[PDB]
Amino acid sequence: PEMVRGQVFDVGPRYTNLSYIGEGAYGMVCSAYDNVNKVRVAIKKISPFEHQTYCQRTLREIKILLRFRHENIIGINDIIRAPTIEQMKDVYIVQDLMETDLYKLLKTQHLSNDHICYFLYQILRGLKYIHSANVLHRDLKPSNLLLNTTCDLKICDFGLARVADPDHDHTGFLTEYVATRWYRAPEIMLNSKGYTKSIDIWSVGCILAEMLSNRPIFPGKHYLDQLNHILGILGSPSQEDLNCIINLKARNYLLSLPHKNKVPWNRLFPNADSKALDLLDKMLTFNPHKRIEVEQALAHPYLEQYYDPSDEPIAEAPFKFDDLPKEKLKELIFEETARFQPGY
Ligand SMILES: N#Cc1c(NCCN2CCCCC2)sc(-c2ccnc(Nc3cccc(O)c3)n2)c1-c1cccc(Cl)c1
Numbered sequence: 537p538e539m540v541r542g543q544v545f546d547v548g549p550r551y552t553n554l555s556y557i558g559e560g561a562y563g564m565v566c567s568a569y570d571n572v573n574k575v576r577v578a579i580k581k582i583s584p585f586e587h588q589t590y591c592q593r594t595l596r597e598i599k600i601l602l603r604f605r606h607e608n609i610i611g612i613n614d615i616i617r618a619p620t621i622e623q624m625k626d627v628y629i630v631q632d633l634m635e636t637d638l639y640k641l642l643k644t645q646h647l648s649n650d651h652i653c654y655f656l657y658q659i660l661r662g663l664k665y666i667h668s669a670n671v672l673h674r675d676l677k678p679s680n681l682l683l684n685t686t687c688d689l690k691i692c693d694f695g696l697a698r699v700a701d702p703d704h705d706h707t708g709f710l711t712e713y714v715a716t717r718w719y720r721a722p723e724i725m726l727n728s729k730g731y732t733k734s735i736d737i738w739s740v741g742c743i744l745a746e747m748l749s750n751r752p753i754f755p756g757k758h759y760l761d762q763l764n765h766i767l768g769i770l771g772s773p774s775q776e777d778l779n780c781i782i783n784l785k786a787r788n789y790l791l792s793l794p795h796k797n798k799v800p801w802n803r804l805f806p807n808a809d810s811k812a813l814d815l816l817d818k819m820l821t822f823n824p825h826k827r828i829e830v831e832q833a834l835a836h837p838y839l840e841q842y843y844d845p846s847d848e849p850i851a852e853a854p855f856k857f858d859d860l861p862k863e864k865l866k867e868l869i870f871e872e873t874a875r876f877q878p879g880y
Contacts, residue, residue: 540566547579547616547628561675561695561714562590567633577613578634582627584869591865593695594627598872600671600694601629603853608662610634610682610690615876624870634682634690638743642678642750649809651687652747656812657834657842658689659740664830666691667733669851670700674730675715676739678746699855701731709785710759717762718742718752722770723824725763726786734824737833741819748805748812753820770822771798777823811838 537546540556543564547554551568557578558565564581584590601612616628638655641647647655659681666673673680675696682690696715707729713720715730721738724730745753753769756762767773772795781787801813808816815838818828828836834843860868874880 540564543581544626545579545581545628546626547630551577551579551616551630560693562593563695570630576633578631579616580629580631582629583625584627585625585862585866588862588865591862591869595865595869595872596697597694598627598629598869600669600697600855602872603855604665604669604851606662606665606849607688608658608690609665610692615873617870617873619877619879621866621870624866627869627873631692634692635684636682638678638681638683638689638747640679641683642746646750647747649812652744652812653809653838653841654687655681655689655747656740656744656815657839659691659743660830660834660839661848662689662691663736663740664834664848665851667700667736667830668854670854670856672698672700672731672733673736673739674698675719676736676743677716677719678743681743698731699857700733701729701857705729705731706783709783709789717756717759718754720756720762721824722763722766722822725760726790727781727783728824732824733829734827737819737827737830738824740833741816744812744816744819745805748808748816753804766822767793767796769799769804770820771796773822777826780823780825809838811836814838 537544538548538554539545540554545554545566547568550572551570553569555567557567560580566579568577568579570577582594584594605611610631612629612631614630617626618624673691673694675693680691680693682692705728707727709726713724713730719739719742721735742753754762754765756765773790778787778790801816805813815833815836819833821827834848
C-alpha cells in the first residue's frame with residue numbers, strides 16, 4: 537500500500553497516483569487515478585470502528601449515498617474495504633473527482649447574477665430530493681458544494697446527516713451543536729436539535745448571502761457570538777416569534793438584549809438582484825415555522841428561468857426513523873458495503 541502523510545491509503549493497485557485533498561466532517565480525502573476506468577477520482581478514508589457515534593454516522597452516510605440517485609448529489613462509484621469483518625479496519629469511498637468547490641471559487645471569483653441564480657437553483661434542486669427522502673443534510677456550506685468546469689453543482693458529505701424528526705427537535709438553551717458554526721440557524725443556539733428541514737433552508741440562505749458578496753454573512757467567532765451576528769442583521773425578534781419559544785432560558789436571554797432594528801438587504805448587497813434579496817429574506821427568516829420550504833423557494837420568481845417541477849425529481853424510497861453497539865454497527869457497515877466486493 538501507498539502512504540500519503542503518515543497514514544496507510546490502501547486503495548491500490550486499481551487506484552494509484554495519490555494526492556491529499558483534505559477532510560470531510562470526518563475522514564481523509566485524496567485524489568487518485570482509476571487504472572480500470574482511466575479517469576481521476578476522489579477517495580475518502582473512514583476509520584470508525586472504535587466508536588459507536590462514528591459507526592452510526594458512517595453507516596447513515598453510506599446508506600444515504602447508496603440510496604440517493606440525483607444529478608445534484610454526488611454518488612458512490614465504489615467502496616474499498618477488506619473481504620472480512622475481522623480484517624476490516626478502514627472503509628474507502630470512491631466518487632467522481634470534481635474540479636473545485638464553491639468555497640475555493642468564492643475566495644477569488646466574483647459571481648455574475650446568472651451564476652448565483654444557477655448555483656442556487658442546483659442547490660435547491662438537490663435539496664428538494666434530500667428533503668423528499670425525509671433526510672436533512674445539516675452541514676450545507678460552500679465547501680460541501682462541488683463544481684466541475686461547466687458549473688454543474690453537486691452536494692457532498694452526508695457525515696452529519698439525519699432522518700428528519702420534528703417531534704423530537706426541542707432542547708434547552710445553549711445545547712452543543714456539531715455542524716459548522718457560521719451556517720447554523722438561530723434556533724440551534726436557542727431550543728432546536730436541528731432535526732427539522734427548516735435547518736437546511738437557513739444554511740442555503742447563508743450560502744446565497746455569501747454568493748452575493750464573497751464573504752460569510754454571519755462569521756460568529758464562538759457559540760453565542762453566532763446568534764449576535766444573526767440578530768445584528770435581522771434585528772430583534774417580534775413578540776409573536778418570541779411567543780413561539782417556550783423555553784424560559786432562551787426567551788429571557790433574547791428579552792435581555794438591547795433592541796436592534798432590521799438591516800435592509802438592499803443596503804448589505806447594493807448590487808444584488810431585487811428578486812434574489814426577496815428570496816434571501818424568506819430563507820433567512822428568524823422563526824423556522826415561517827421560513828420558506830424548499831419547493832416554495834424553487835417556485836420563487838428569482839428562479840423562474842429554471843423552475844420545472846416535473847424535472848425536479850423526488851426520492852423513490854424515503855428513510856424512516858439507532859442505539860445499537862459499535863460491534864453490531866460494524867456488521868451493518870460490512871453488509872452495506874458488500875455489493876462493491878470483487879466476488880459480487
Ligand atoms: N466528505 C467529503 C468530501 C469532501 N469534503 C470537503 C473537503 N474540502 C477539501 C478542500 C478544502 C475544503 C474542504 S470533498 C469530496 C470530493 C468528492 C469528489 N470530488 C471532490 N473534489 C475536490 C474537492 C475539493 C478540492 C479538490 O481539489 C477536489 N471532492 C468528498 C468525498 C470524497 C470521496 C468520497 C466521499 Cl463520501 C466524499
